[PDB]
Amino acid sequence: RDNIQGITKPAIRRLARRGGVKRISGLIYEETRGVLKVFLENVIRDAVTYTEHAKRKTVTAMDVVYALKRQGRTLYGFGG
Amino acid sequence: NIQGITKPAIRRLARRGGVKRISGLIYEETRGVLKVFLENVIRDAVTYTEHAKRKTVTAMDVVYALKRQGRTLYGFGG
Amino acid sequence: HRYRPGTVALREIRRYQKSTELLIRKLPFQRLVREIAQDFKTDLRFQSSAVMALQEACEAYLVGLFEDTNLCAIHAKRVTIMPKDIQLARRIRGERA
Amino acid sequence: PHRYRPGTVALREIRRYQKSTELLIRKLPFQRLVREIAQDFKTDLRFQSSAVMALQEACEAYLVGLFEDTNLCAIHAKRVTIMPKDIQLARRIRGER
Amino acid sequence: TRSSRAGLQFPVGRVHRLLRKGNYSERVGAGAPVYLAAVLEYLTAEILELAGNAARDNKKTRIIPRHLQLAIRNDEELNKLLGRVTIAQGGVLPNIQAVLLPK
Amino acid sequence: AKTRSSRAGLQFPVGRVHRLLRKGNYSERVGAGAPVYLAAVLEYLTAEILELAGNAARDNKKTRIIPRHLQLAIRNDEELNKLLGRVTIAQGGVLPNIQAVLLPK
Amino acid sequence: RSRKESYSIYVYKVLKQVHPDTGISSKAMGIMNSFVNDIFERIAGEASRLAHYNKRSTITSREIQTAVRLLLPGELAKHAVSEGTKAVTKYTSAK
Amino acid sequence: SRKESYSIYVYKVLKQVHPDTGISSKAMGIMNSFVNDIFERIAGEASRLAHYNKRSTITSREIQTAVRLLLPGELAKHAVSEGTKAVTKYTSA
DNA sequence: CCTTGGCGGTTAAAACGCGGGGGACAGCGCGTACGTGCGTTTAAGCGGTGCTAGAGCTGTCTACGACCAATTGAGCGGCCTCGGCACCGGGATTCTGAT
DNA sequence: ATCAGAATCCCGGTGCCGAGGCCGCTCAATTGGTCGTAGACAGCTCTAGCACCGCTTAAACGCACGTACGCGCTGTCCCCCGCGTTTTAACCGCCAAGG
């Protein structure tokens, strides 16, 4: 519960600064939280499918990396 | 040459997407982007033809070049 | 008589919304495609369905880019599209590095 | 110890956080969100440290890219501040929901 | 024949032959071609029924590619699936934004 | 020369690539010249990435290569950024990109 | 001579079950054939990569099922898994 | 367990390129994942080309046209030249 | 027995003059939204503890897929028919500019 | 609003052609067997994920705070568009070829 708000407002501030935002609005945080939640839902579902087919109930690093690979946001350094 | 994509052709292409007012410098940017896209797709198709050892580009080659570009098209028995 | 600007374009948009025929005529786009291809080979030819597929793909890509450009202009509180709008659409698309 | 007009402090934070590379989204709240999301789907889920770190870094990269696209949309619109409509347009052009 | 032994128009022999020629693994299970054929049959069936819906929207019985593309674009799921995929003689939905309507 | 790697004069192992292709489920039979060409292509791509990674490192005067250098090298070069615009490097960040109007006036 | 294969008859049949009073242009029939081939090869490639990562060289019904779970959207994935499981059971039950 | 990696080959390549430069283990994993992804992409594209062309075997022309297709013109040309030089070096002796 | 174009003939399309007025274009009220700080309120994370089934590998057998050769019936090759949807033209819907 | 005046929504007609009717053909999908291995079942093993608090410390919290770039409101100036207009040349027919 309330984990969607777990990403604090200053954390989103730092994310924006890395992105390159100078002026940040107050409703940006909620939309960013929604985008993060949707992307996490997709990647987690893909990784869960990967680990279920393996008959392993533990989500492994290779499962998540392969899920990111299939989603078009392939991430490196973690096997797969 | 590049005038083959005519002013009315660019007008119709823009109006298909819902554009209302078009500037005089839009034609140059549109023709440049279309030239880049055509160069890429025709490059892929000609590379397919070179691989095929044939003399003429086939419809399958164009469709699969589009697919490799991520622009798959239906209607041609791909 | 002389109408006010703006309504006509909406009328042809509504009418052409019911048709799917290819916009660009055959021979000029044909010549453009073949002169671009001449930079890759000499005396090279395409297939008929290959040419039609190239026309469909070019029309679809250009229409998508124009929709992106119009959306960028409207979101920029503008109605007439400018090449900078196309540049923004290309940059967000990721093609331009 | 000073407060300036809006932006120089923003520029300082931007310089600091572009000079820094460590994770901006904190690991514990992000992992808690991941576990909350995964609870609704499947029970008895164990996550590896590298898996959660991969989730965190991929999400950070996607968010930063979306922020870059939003900044491009705003600046192209002659605007400094970003609005939810800016993010809507950026995601519309990007194509990931 | 194995066409109707799986209760599908698409035969098992053709699909299993395609699987064997694709070398998708060392060996293909018995239910894999049947699974694929059933999924394909349902997908083409729903595509064609939304095509018929588009056809009756256009007041025409015979399916034209315009009907197919309207079927693709009305449904949110299919537009999500075949959004990057274009159709020859396809078109797009009736889409009018209210911002540009005259006063 | 006993191993085929010495005959080909490359660095990447031909044997492990051949084993992976065998356990690859993409082809029944593999030619005798494809592995060498693929190894050369992979080596050239790795060298292309590593040259710009070292360029960034020497710009930063850092011997060890952190993922920040990899991401900066991938994003800076037009060819790699166009090629790998959809590719994400862990702990990489993004380029320092300041627009003209972003600087205070 | 070349005897190229086509899914014309099966696609015509399927449209006839879903719409008897509905003709289909050869363009639409080709579109349906292309869609069928695309989806089949998509699920086949997903199963191939699942067999790759799982260190198992056998594609049973489980591999295609998880491929469909990964490929098709949630509600569509659920429907396809249900129908494919029913098809697999009825295929295994009989001769 | 018996999990192979390409760390030593990357180290040797770095030594032959930069004799006095190191790299991190995280960057090593990033390079390993990049190699895996590019290998998967190349294998899939070769598979699709072979299935279209009805070829039961793979030759150098397939991978050459693959390099031409995927990489841009200059990078594709350089990679093709390097691979052809390697093939000629192996075949000549 | 194929694909641009050789081009005849087309007939409506390329190319463009051009007005006018509403939009491009910047300027500027204005002031509510809100950087920046920054203490208050929050609880991060970094290093720990044993819990402890289960990832992974090995066993493992045997159910289940591959291999062989006969098979056998539908898969897609050949020509012909004829009304849905496009066209030729009228008539009536459904709009909207000037009013 | 108010009808004008074209302009779009659906129509009877209409005629020569896209889909789809009739019947083979014909080899590959189908048959059962017999090989034959891999993987799910069974069990194995210790590793880093686990429950949990528990303190730290960089960081999160709240709205008072400046305040500037945002948006009310408009002039600006004009870039273009509506339409006719005339020239453009691509297209309906015509079969190509070559291996």
Swiss-Prot record, chain B:
N6-glutaryllysine modified-residue sites: K7, K35, K53, K55, K67
Residues with N6-(2-hydroxyisobutyryl)lysine modification: K7, K20, K35, K53, K55, K67
GO molecular function, one term: RNA binding
Listed result of changing R21C: In TEBIVANED3
Localization of this protein: Nucleus; Chromosome
N6-(beta-hydroxybutyryl)lysine modified-residue sites: K7, K53, K67
Reported impact of R11W: In TEBIVANED3; results in early developmental defects when expressed in zebrafish embryos
Subunit structure and binding partners: The nucleosome is a histone octamer containing two molecules each of H2A, H2B, H3 and H4 assembled in one H3-H4 heterotetramer and two H2A-H2B heterodimers. The octamer wraps approximately 147 bp of DNA. Found in a co-chaperone complex with DNJC9, MCM2 and histone H3.3-H4 dimers. Within the complex, interacts with DNJC9 (via C-terminus); the interaction is direct. Interacts with NASP; NASP is a histone chaperone that stabilizes and maintains a soluble pool of Histone H3-H4 dimers.
Designated name of the protein: Histone H4
Lineage: Eukaryota, Metazoa, Chordata, Craniata, Vertebrata
Location of this fragment in the whole protein: 26 to 103 of 103
From Swiss-Prot, chain E:
Entry comment on modification after translation: It is involved in the initiation of both imprinted and random X inactivation. Ubiquitinated H2A is enriched in inactive X chromosome chromatin. Ubiquitination of H2A functions downstream of methylation of 'Lys-27' of histone H3 (H3K27me). H2AK119Ub by RNF2/RING2 can also be induced by ultraviolet and may be involved in DNA repair. Glutamine methylation at Gln-89 (H2AQ104me) by FBL is specifically dedicated to polymerase I. It is present at 35S ribosomal DNA locus and impairs binding of the FACT complex.
Modified residues (N6-(2-hydroxyisobutyryl)lysine): K21, K59, K60, K80, K103
UniProt keyword annotations, A-Z: Acetylation, Chromosome, Citrullination, DNA-binding, Hydroxylation, Isopeptide bond, Methylation, Nucleosome core, Nucleus, Phosphoprotein, Ubl conjugation
Gene Ontology biological-process entries: chromatin organization; heterochromatin formation; negative regulation of cell population proliferation; protein localization to CENP-A containing chromatin
Modified residues (N6-glutaryllysine): K80, K103
Keyword Zinc: no
Positions carrying N6-crotonyllysine: K21, K103
Cellular component GO terms held in the UniProt record: CENP-A containing nucleosome; extracellular exosome; nucleosome; nucleus
Major subcellular location class: nucleus
Subcellular location: Nucleus; Chromosome
Phosphoprotein keyword on record: yes
Modified residues (N5-methylglutamine): Q89
Modified residues (N6-(beta-hydroxybutyryl)lysine): K21, K80, K103
Positions bearing N6-succinyllysine: K80
Transmembrane region(s): none
Molecular function via GO: DNA binding; protein heterodimerization activity; structural constituent of chromatin
Protein family: Belongs to the histone H2A family.
Function: Core component of nucleosome. Nucleosomes wrap and compact DNA into chromatin, limiting DNA accessibility to the cellular machineries which require DNA as a template. Histones thereby play a central role in transcription regulation, DNA repair, DNA replication and chromosomal stability. DNA accessibility is regulated via a complex set of post-translational modifications of histones, also called histone code, and nucleosome remodeling.
Record-given protein name: Histone H2A type 1-B/E
Organism: Homo sapiens (Human)
The organism's taxonomic lineage, starting at the top: Eukaryota, Metazoa, Chordata, Craniata, Vertebrata
Gene from which this protein is expressed: H2AC4
Swiss-Prot record, chain G:
Modification type N6-succinyllysine: residues: K4, K86, K90
Modified residues (N6,N6-dimethyllysine): K27
PTM annotation (N6-glutaryllysine): residues: K4, K13, K16, K78, K86, K90
Phosphoserine PTM sites in chain numbering: S6
PTM-bearing positions, type N6-methyllysine: K16, K78
N6-(2-hydroxyisobutyryl)lysine: modified positions: K4, K13, K16, K27, K55, K78, K86, K90
Modified residues (N6-methylated lysine): K86
Residues found modified as Dimethylated arginine: R49
List of residues that carry Phosphothreonine: T85
Residues annotated with N6,N6,N6-trimethyllysine modification: K55
TM helices/strands, residue ranges: none
Location of Omega-N-methylarginine modifications: R56, R62
Cross-link Glycyl lysine isopeptide (Lys-Gly) (interchain with G-Cter in ubiquitin), where in sequence: K4, K90
Modified residues (N6-acetyllysine): K55
Modified positions (PolyADP-ribosyl glutamic acid) in chain numbering: E5
GO cellular component, one term: nucleoplasm
N6-(beta-hydroxybutyryl)lysine PTM positions: K4, K55, K86, K90
Molecular functions per Gene Ontology: DNA binding; lipopolysaccharide binding; protein heterodimerization activity; structural constituent of chromatin
Subunit-level organization: The nucleosome is a histone octamer containing two molecules each of H2A, H2B, H3 and H4 assembled in one H3-H4 heterotetramer and two H2A-H2B heterodimers. The octamer wraps approximately 147 bp of DNA. Heterodimer H2BC11 and H2AZ1 interacts with VPS72 (via N-terminal domain).
The protein's role, per its UniProt record: Core component of nucleosome. Nucleosomes wrap and compact DNA into chromatin, limiting DNA accessibility to the cellular machineries which require DNA as a template. Histones thereby play a central role in transcription regulation, DNA repair, DNA replication and chromosomal stability. DNA accessibility is regulated via a complex set of post-translational modifications of histones, also called histone code, and nucleosome remodeling.
Name of the featured protein: Histone H2B type 1-J
Organism: Homo sapiens
